[PDB]
Amino acid sequence: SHMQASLLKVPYFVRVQGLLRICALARKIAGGHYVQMAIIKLGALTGTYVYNHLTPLRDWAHNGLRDLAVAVEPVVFSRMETKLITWGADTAACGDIINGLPVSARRGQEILLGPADGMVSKGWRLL
Amino acid sequence: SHMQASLLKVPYFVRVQGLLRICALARKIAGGHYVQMAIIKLGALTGTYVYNHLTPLRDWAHNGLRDLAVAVEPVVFSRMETKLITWGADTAACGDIINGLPVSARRGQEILLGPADGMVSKGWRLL
Ligand SMILES: CCCCCCCCO[C@@H]1O[C@H](CO)[C@@H](O)[C@H](O)[C@H]1O
Numbered sequence A, B: 001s002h003m004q005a006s007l008l009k010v011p012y013f014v015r016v017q018g019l020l021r022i023c024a025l026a027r028k029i030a031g032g033h034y035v036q037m038a039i040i041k042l043g044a045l046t047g048t049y050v051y052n053h054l055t056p057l058r059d060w061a062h063n064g065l066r067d068l069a070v071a072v073e074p075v076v077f078s079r080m081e082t083k084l085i086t087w088g089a090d091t092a093a094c095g096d097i098i099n100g101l102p103v104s105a106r107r108g109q110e111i112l113l114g115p116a117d118g119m120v121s122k123g124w125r126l127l
C-alpha cells in the first residue's frame, strides 16, 4: 500500500515482528536499551513504527528503553509534531501530494495519484 | 497544509501563478521549451505541480513544451507511476505514514499523525 511508505515490500505486521525480534536479542544486555533505540530508529528510517498498544514494551523492552523514549504511540526518541487531518476522497484536490505523488483525479471513492492523462475517457474526473 | 507537502507556506494556487509568471518570460524565446521545462521541474521538487485543466498550456507554454512533456495532467517530463488509492478516516490504520508522520489515532472524521500519547484522554482512539 502506497499509504504505508515502506522501503521494503513486506507486510507491516511482519516488519514489526522482524524488528522486535532483533530488539529481543538486546533486551538483557548491558547497554541493551541504547541498542534497541538504535534499531527502532533504524526501523523508522525504513518506514516502520512500533506502537505500545499493539506490541507492548513489557513484552520485549530493556528496562532502560522507556526512559529514553519521549513517546510510545508510536515509540520515538525526539520531539515529533502532532497534526490533525480530515483528508478523504471527498476533500482531495489538485495541489495535494501524497507520499510523493500528486493528486490528479477521482472516480467514486477512489483517488488517482500521478498522471491522469487519458483517464477521463474512463470515468475519472480531474480535480 | 500537511497534505500539500509544499516546502513553501504559500497557497497552492498562488504558487502556480508565480511559477507560470516565470515560464511566460520564456514563452516566445528560442529554446524556451527547455527553459520552461527546467522551471516546471524546479517547481516539482518544491512541491508544486501544474495541470493543463487548471492552467492550459495554450495560455503560457512555449510551442515546443508539449513535445517534451510525457503528460500534462500534471506536466511531467519522465515516467511517473500512477497509483489508485482508497483511504480515509474509516480506513486509516497504524503502519500508515502520511507525508512523513505515522498514523496513530482517530477521533471522528479526523486522523491524528505523530505521537498519540496522552490523547486517549481527549476522546481519541488508537488505531
Ligand atoms: C526491519 C525490517 C525487517 C524485514 C525482515 C522481516 C522478517 C520477518 O520475519 C518474520 O519473523 C517472525 C518471527 O520473528 C515469523 O513468525 C514470521 O513468519 C516471519 O515472516
Ligand SMILES: CCCCCCCCO[C@@H]1O[C@H](CO)[C@@H](O)[C@H](O)[C@H]1O
Binding pocket: B008, B010, B014, B015, B017, B018, B019, B021, B043, B046, B048
Ligand atoms: C514556486 C513558488 C513561487 C512563489 C511565488 C509566489 C508569487 C505570488 O504571485 C502573486 O501573488 C499575488 C497574491 O498572492 C497575486 O495577486 C498576483 O497576481 C501573483 O502574481
Ligand SMILES: CCCCCCCCO[C@@H]1O[C@H](CO)[C@@H](O)[C@H](O)[C@H]1O
Binding pocket: B030, B031, B032, B034, B035, B038
Ligand atoms: C540550465 C539549462 C538551461 C536550458 C535553456 C537553454 C536555452 C538556450 O538558449 C540559447 O541562447 C542563445 C543565445 O546565446 C540563442 O542563440 C539560442 O537560440 C538559444 O537556444
Ligand SMILES: CCCCCCCCO[C@@H]1O[C@H](CO)[C@@H](O)[C@H](O)[C@H]1O
Binding pocket: B038, B039, B041, B042, B044, B045, B078
Ligand atoms: C537551475 C537549473 C535547474 C535545473 C532543474 C533541475 C530539476 C531536477 O529535477 C529532477 O527531477 C526528478 C523527478 O522528476 C528527481 O527525481 C530528481 O532528483 C531531480 O533532480
